[PDB]
């Protein structure tokens, strides 16, 4: 038993949102079996949208009543979900699950899909250099970062390389935050102080792999020594 979701990755506010839950391996003929939708905004808990039983029996949430519609098609074996009056605060990932009886609720879960509701467009990310202004305190090591801004949807992977195309293990990845209708993220890397006062390499390159452009700006080291 497995479930698969599908739908648009970007929808404008105050529009119509449609999602499809693809399942195969069972039929909604026996009693107790049902399909439900659960969403979870980032940093929040699960939210119950609606649940539909057999014999075309559907249940809706009073907090969201008269705003959602549940339709099923046994021919294609997939439930259709329609969402109207889209709001930026309602952005979340939607999941569907199968209930195998009256007591075993949501036994199998799919994978879900991120549906971003932003008035903006999917523009290429913008990188900005970061210069460390630390002074009078070299401390253990020095840090240099890379500010990826104006990206949508939030799907970015960070990799750090030296001037000679080496490999660096940073693993410092900060989650994105919705600020002014756009997602912003920050990434840094830790480098030893000895290497700064050594090789002639005075800068490193910041690389981001986003499906809107393959730009890669370089962040120059401030050098303190």
């Amino acid at each position: 038993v497995t479930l698969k979701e599908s739908g648009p990755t970007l929808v404008k506010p105050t529009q119509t949102l449609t999602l499809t839950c693809t399942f195969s391996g069972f039929s909604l003929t026996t009693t107790g079996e049902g399909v439900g939708w659960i969403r979870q905004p980032p940093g929040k808990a699960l939210e119950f949208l609606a649940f539909i039983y057999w014999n075309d029996a559907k249940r809706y949430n009073p907090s969201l009543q008269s705003r959602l519609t549940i339709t099923k098609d046994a021919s294609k074996k997939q439930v259709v979900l329609t969402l109207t009056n889209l709001d930026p605060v309602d952005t979340a990932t939607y999941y569907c699950a199968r209930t195998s009886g009256w007591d075993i609720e949501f036994e199998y879960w799919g994978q879900g899909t991120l549906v971003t509701v932003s008035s903006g467009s999917a523009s290429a990310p913008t990188l900005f250099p970061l210069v460390s202004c630390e002074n009078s305190s070299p401390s253990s090591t020095v840090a240099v970062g890379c500010l990826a801004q104006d990206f949508l949807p939030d799907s970015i992977t960070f990799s750090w390389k030296y001037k000679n195309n080496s490999d660096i293990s940073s693993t410092r990845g900060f989650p994105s935050v919705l600020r002014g209708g756009k997602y912003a993220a920050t990434s840094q890397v830790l480098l030893p102080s000895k290497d700064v006062m050594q090789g002639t390499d005075e800068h490193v390159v910041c690389k981001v792999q986003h499906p809107n452009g393959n730009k890669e700006k370089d962040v120059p080291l401030p050098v303190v020594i």
């Binding site: 439900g36 659960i38 808990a45 699960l46 939210e47 119950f48 609606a50 649940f51 249940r59 809706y60 949430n61 009073p62 999941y95 007591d103 075993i104 609720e105 949501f106 036994e107 879960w109 799919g110 994978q111 879900g112 900005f128 250099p129 970061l130 210069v131 460390s132 202004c133 630390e134 401390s139 253990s140 840090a143 970062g145 500010l147 801004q149 410092r172 990845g173 900060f174 989650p175 994105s176 935050v177 600020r179 912003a184 993220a185 920050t186 840094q188 401030p222």
Partner: protein
């Protein structure tokens, strides 16, 4: 409308010990139809126990449920590193059903002094009319920390979102980033920008600042 509240929000446990999760309901649930779910960030939630007393297929026997009415407790014997995820309690006797806030369990560790670094906005970024000042906190414990922005002795408010990373897999520490956003015209009207960091393991607050034009 059954309101479910879970407390405490965050608890620090150690591997091998016993962890007890509390689930509070706003009213009695018919037939004690309360179930527990396990969710890991990135992946999808998985069912563990249905009906608060019967486990499901592919679930270890170390998870046990107890209680009835409006009080439910989840006991887990033999805590494992992979079990440090968020857990939710949900009842299916409401129709429509409701979900709780959820509780997160973290690995208990010693207090480590954080590292504070501030990067002034680049000249290229200033050309776009937006200035971004960052305040980075790394290698601190516990997750609870206060980050306040003070510029020209004036405390700022209502302009900091605050982003915090998850627990490190190999270091068990936490990291967070604070971003300062202000207009380009307002940026030129201020000289010194500083973010104050307060930590439990620090005797006195440490403040870092920079001078405009020297960086």
């Amino acid at each position: 409308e059954i309101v479910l509240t879970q407390s405490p929000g965050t608890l620090s446990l150690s591997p091998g010990e016993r962890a007890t999760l509390s689930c509070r309901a706003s009213e009695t649930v018919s037939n004690d139809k309360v179930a527990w779910y396990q969710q890991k960030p990135g992946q999808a939630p998985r069912l563990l126990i249905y009906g608060a007393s019967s486990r499901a297929t592919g679930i270890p026997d170390r998870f046990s449920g107890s209680g009835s009415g409006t009080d439910f407790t989840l006991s887990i014997s033999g805590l494992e590193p992979e079990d440090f995820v968020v857990y939710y309690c949900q009842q299916y006797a409401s129709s429509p059903r409701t979900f709780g806030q959820g509780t997160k369990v973290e690995i208990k560790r010693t207090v480590a002094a954080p590292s504070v670094f501030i990067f002034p906005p680049s000249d290229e970024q200033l050309k776009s009319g937006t200035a971004s000042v960052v305040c980075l906190l790394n290698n601190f414990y516990p997750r609870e920390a206060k980050v306040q922005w003070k510029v020209d002795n004036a405390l700022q408010s209502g302009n900091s979102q605050e982003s915090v990373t998850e627990q490190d897999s190999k270091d068990s520490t936490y990291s967070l980033s604070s971003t300062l956003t202000l207009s380009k015209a307002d940026y030129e009207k201020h000289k010194v920008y500083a973010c104050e960091v307060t930590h439990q393991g620090l005797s006195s607050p440490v403040t870092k600042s920079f001078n405009r034009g020297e960086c």
